[PDB]
């Protein structure tokens, strides 16, 4: 339209991948512009994913603590404990609102140029950004970086209205706690969200096609103990089970139609809300790739080479829309790296050392290979385990759930995988991550002085168990 803009790097999308790549590109002296179609920045991580659902599990956690037996049993005693869901929700949003302001502020600081509108490649060096009032902005650029992220994989036959039938993003804003509630899918997203409303007073049942809870690449042992723990809290699961369809009815209630994934024990669960959590797919709608001759992965992703280059060399792609785990830190990482690459630097990323975390309570975090991957691979390994019931910090806080499982290669004692089910798993898994990028051995990590008493100490004791054959406290 008006007056064409000039850029080195044009970043499409403003989520975790996009906003750091833009700032990094900036920090490196690139006339960077970042286009985002939405009102606020932060993409999905910040606005309808990570941060909300986290702010929400945090709150929902303290509630169950205060309403349950935990508090009364540690001296703190309340008359009654009601829940003010709107006040709770407001907490979450204030956090999000504050963070999204930050990103914008981070942009000014670095002289990143934020263009608002639904961008789309209209040249090998041009993208058109169009606001809905028909306004338009053309950037003439040297490189284009795509970070259009992802969307909900929708369930065919079941239409999400975002009211009584919802996705991640509607379950984050429930205007009230449902009585009964079903979750199609027991992945990290589903499990987390279900747990929130469970903790709040909802009777929650997840239905999964596969035979385990937690996502892919989770250890089957820690998955099963994990599921078991949720089952105790009140969560119910219906594994190896497919839905035929679900039906809305007179009085509002929803009727989902379940049946064995293989055989057929046709049953019918009836709830008040139905969260559909079956996956999430890359998002490239109207980017203009069909016309530049860029074919997609058969799963909707962009084929990029080692330096994150698409079939068209000056056009890269990174984050949810490209292969690898759909994680935020994972995108930030490709984001930075890809740019440092344009800059003329080396682009190595080790996808084995990318921590995975589920933030329920207890947390589940892991990094490296699981037992099943190590077998399928043909690798001779050994395992050491230290339960939190034996960890002092843990026992002292009356929170003794889970264990830390370490996988070390049988001969070189090289740590091949660390898996933590328990309190403080999310922050523990980073220490692991580190050790793993070092080619640590269970011995090395055991000779490190971990402070007492900490959750960490059980991470130490599990390697002590894997490299010597038994620990001191267990």
């Amino acid at each position: 339209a008006d007056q064409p803009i000039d850029a080195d790097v044009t970043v499409i999308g403003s989520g975790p991948g996009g906003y750091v790549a833009a700032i990094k590109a900036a920090q490196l002296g690139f006339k960077t512009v970042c286009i985002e179609k939405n009102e606020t920045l932060g993409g999905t991580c910040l606005n309808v994913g990570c941060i909300p659902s986290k702010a929400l599990l945090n709150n929902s956690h303290y509630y169950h603590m205060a309403h349950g037996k935990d508090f009364a049993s540690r001296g703190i005693e309340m008359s009654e404990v009601r829940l003010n869901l709107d006040k709770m929700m407001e907490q979450k949003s204030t956090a999000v609102k504050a963070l999204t302001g930050g990103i914008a502020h981070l942009f000014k600081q670095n002289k990143v140029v934020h263009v608002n509108g639904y961008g789309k490649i209209t040249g090998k060096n041009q993208v058109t950004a169009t606001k809905a009032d028909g306004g338009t902005q053309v950037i003439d650029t040297k490189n284009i970086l795509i970070a259009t992220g992802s969307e909900v994989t929708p369930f065919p036959g079941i239409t999400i209205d975002e009211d009584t039938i919802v996705s991640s993003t509607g379950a984050l804003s429930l205007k009230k706690v449902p009585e009964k509630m079903v979750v199609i899918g027991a992945g990290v997203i589903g499990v987390e969200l279900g747990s929130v409303w469970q903790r709040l007073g909802a009777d929650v049942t997840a239905v999964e096609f596969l035979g385990h809870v937690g996502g892919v690449g989770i250890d089957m042992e820690i998955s099963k103990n994990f599921q078991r723990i949720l089952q105790k809290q009140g969560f119910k699961f219906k594994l190896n089970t497919k839905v035929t369809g679900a039906t809305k009815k007179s009085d509002g209630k929803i009727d989902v139609s379940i049946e064995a994934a293989s055989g057929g024990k046709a049953e019918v669960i009836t709830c008040d809300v139905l969260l559909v959590c079956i996956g999430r797919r890359p998002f490239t709608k109207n980017l203009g790739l069909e016309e530049l001759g860029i074919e997609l992965d058969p799963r909707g992703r962009i084929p990029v080479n080692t330096r994150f280059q698409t079939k068209i060399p000056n056009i890269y792609a990174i984050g949810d829309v490209v292969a690898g785990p759909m994680l935020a830190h994972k995108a930030e990482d490709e984001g930075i790296i890809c740019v440092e690459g344009m800059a003329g630097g080396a682009v190595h990323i080790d996808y084995n050392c990318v921590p995975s975390v589920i933030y329920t309570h207890p947390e589940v975090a892991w990094v490296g290979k699981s037992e099943e991957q190590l077998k399928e691979e043909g690798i001779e390994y050994k395992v050491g385990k230290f339960p939190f019931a034996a960890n002092s910090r843990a026992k002292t806080n009356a929170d003794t759930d889970g264990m830390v499982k370490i996988l070390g290669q049988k001969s070189t004692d090289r740590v091949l995988g660390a898996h933590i089910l328990g309190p403080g798993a999310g922050e523990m898994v980073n220490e692991a991550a580190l050790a793993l990028e070092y080619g640590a051995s269970c011995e090395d990590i055991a000779r490190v002085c971990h402070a007492h008493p900490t959750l960490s100490e059980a991470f130490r004791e599990a390697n002590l168990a894997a490299s010597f054959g038994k620990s001191i406290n267990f």
Binding site: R414, E437, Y438, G439, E443, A446, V448
Partner: protein, 44 residues
Amino acid sequence: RLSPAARNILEKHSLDASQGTATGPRGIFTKEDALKLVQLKQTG
């Protein structure tokens, strides 16, 4: 330059890495690395 264990276990075997060489990540002399110095002693 030496993973904890690599160093600890050189010491126990009254020798250092000036001989054997490094490997693994930040050119840190590995325990794998040291073990090989270790086995080269016996072998020898």
